[PDB]
Design an enzyme around this catalytic site. Structure first.
Site, mmCIF file in Angstrom:
data_model
loop_
_atom_site.group_PDB
_atom_site.id
_atom_site.type_symbol
_atom_site.label_atom_id
_atom_site.label_comp_id
_atom_site.label_asym_id
_atom_site.label_seq_id
_atom_site.Cartn_x
_atom_site.Cartn_y
_atom_site.Cartn_z
ATOM 1 N N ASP A 117 65.525 18.524 75.265
ATOM 2 C CA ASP A 117 66.828 18.271 74.633
ATOM 3 C C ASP A 117 66.841 16.945 73.876
ATOM 4 O O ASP A 117 67.478 16.825 72.818
ATOM 5 C CB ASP A 117 67.952 18.273 75.689
ATOM 6 C CG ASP A 117 68.634 19.629 75.829
ATOM 7 O OD1 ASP A 117 68.071 20.638 75.370
ATOM 8 O OD2 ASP A 117 69.751 19.696 76.383
ATOM 9 N N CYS B 72 64.901 25.935 63.422
ATOM 10 C CA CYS B 72 65.389 25.327 64.647
ATOM 11 C C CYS B 72 66.911 25.424 64.513
ATOM 12 O O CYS B 72 67.410 26.482 64.150
ATOM 13 C CB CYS B 72 64.820 23.927 64.810
ATOM 14 S SG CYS B 72 64.824 22.873 63.335
ATOM 15 N N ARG C 203 62.407 19.780 64.062
ATOM 16 C CA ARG C 203 61.341 20.513 64.736
ATOM 17 C C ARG C 203 60.603 21.421 63.755
ATOM 18 O O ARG C 203 59.366 21.477 63.751
ATOM 19 C CB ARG C 203 61.937 21.321 65.898
ATOM 20 C CG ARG C 203 62.434 20.391 67.027
ATOM 21 C CD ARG C 203 63.197 21.099 68.132
ATOM 22 N NE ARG C 203 64.576 21.300 67.718
ATOM 23 C CZ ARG C 203 65.529 21.868 68.451
ATOM 24 N NH1 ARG C 203 65.257 22.315 69.668
ATOM 25 N NH2 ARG C 203 66.757 22.003 67.935
ATOM 26 N N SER C 204 61.352 22.122 62.905
ATOM 27 C CA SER C 204 60.741 23.011 61.921
ATOM 28 C C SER C 204 59.811 22.253 60.980
ATOM 29 O O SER C 204 58.735 22.761 60.608
ATOM 30 C CB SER C 204 61.809 23.716 61.105
ATOM 31 O OG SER C 204 62.623 24.619 61.860
ATOM 32 N N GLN D 181 63.132 14.551 61.375
ATOM 33 C CA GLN D 181 64.435 13.903 61.475
ATOM 34 C C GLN D 181 64.420 12.566 62.189
ATOM 35 O O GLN D 181 65.437 11.861 62.145
ATOM 36 C CB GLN D 181 65.403 14.806 62.214
ATOM 37 C CG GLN D 181 66.023 15.811 61.327
ATOM 38 C CD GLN D 181 67.085 16.604 62.068
ATOM 39 O OE1 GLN D 181 66.796 17.312 63.038
ATOM 40 N NE2 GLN D 181 68.320 16.475 61.625
#
Length: 299
Positions: free
Chosen positions: A181, A215, A221-222, A262
């Protein structure tokens, strides 16, 4: 400069946040006018994440061709990817339309439906064989065929039917369930084991349409997934790890979709994955078996 040495320089000096800010400053800025049209407001999950006009995927329909999805085309690596957001309740039908129209064989999902107590993605595939899904707006039917559940990722075998033509295709759904998370995984072994599972399936290969990667917003994440795959492919083609500049590859990808990677710790994690992945590319085949063992995928 070998990236493993650049990595130690950055790590020892604690300059990840500084490198990452430089990347943001240098990144491309292209218009995203179609995304911001009022008719499209309910097709975007996040106000600040939009596809550029020049690289957006167009739905093959006359009413409204808009989906929040971008085509990343990596010319030297000869790989493409579609990066997209987690579908919304009203765009699940558009999502599968895109999969069909782009001839994709694989869907890579890097998030959970619920994260941090809030919903991050619609439940867009069926959870039981006997309860198929029908997307009436796009005339598609989706059936779960089989599911292979491992400890931190699941592979599903889905059948997508175009109800207009009765044609069907097998779609593979690769679902990474154990991205934490907060932060990034401590080791990339599990990540790389998953990436090479996707590769082994044929989903990234030129005989199929581009893999769809998402994602929640389709950038973080992508972005980490596509960046690691392309960097390893380039090192493969050249058999030269020191030629490949991760930061330059990332900026190239950011010409096609904004915001990829990110956080500074996703950038650091991307270097770690490429560095560890390199051992396999340069001919230590046994490393792949070690990743599987370290990943503790079984049970």
């Amino acid at each position: 400069m070998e990236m493993e040495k650049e990595f130690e320089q950055i790590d020892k000096s604690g300059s990840w946040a500084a490198i990452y800010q430089d990347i943001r400053h240098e990144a491309s800025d292209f218009p995203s006018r179609v995304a911001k049209l009022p008719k499209n407001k309910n097709r975007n999950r996040y106000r600040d994440v939009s596809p550029f006009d020049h690289s957006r995927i167009k739905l093959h329909q006359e009413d409204n061709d808009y989906i929040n999805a971008s085509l990343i085309k990596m010319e030297e690596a000869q790989r493409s990817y579609i990066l997209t957001q987690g579908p919304l309740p009203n765009t699940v039908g558009h999502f599968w339309e895109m999969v069909w129209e782009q001839k994709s064989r694989g869907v890579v999902m890097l998030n959970r439906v619920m994260e941090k107590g809030s919903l991050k993605c619609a439940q867009y595939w069926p959870q039981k064989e006997e309860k198929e899904m029908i997307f009436e707006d796009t005339n598609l039917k989706l059936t779960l065929i089989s599911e292979d559940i491992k400890s931190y990722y699941t592979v599903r075998q889905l059948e997508l039917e175009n109800l207009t033509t009765q044609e069907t295709r097998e779609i593979l759904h690769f679902h990474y369930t154990t991205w934490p998370d907060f932060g990034v995984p401590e080791s990339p072994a599990s990540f790389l084991n998953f990436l090479f599972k996707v590769r082994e399936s044929g989903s990234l290969s030129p005989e199929h349409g581009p893999v769809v990667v998402h994602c929640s917003a389709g950038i973080g994440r992508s972005g980490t997934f596509c960046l690691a795959d392309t960097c390893l492919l380039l090192m493969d083609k050249r058999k030269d790890p020191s030629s490949v500049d991760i930061k330059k590859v990332l900026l190239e990808m950011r010409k096609f979709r904004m915001g990829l990677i990110q956080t500074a710790d996703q950038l650091r994690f991307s270097y770690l994955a490429v560095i560890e992945g390199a051992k396999f590319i340069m001919g230590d085949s046994s490393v792949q078996d070690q990743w599987k063992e370290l990943s503790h995928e079984d049970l």
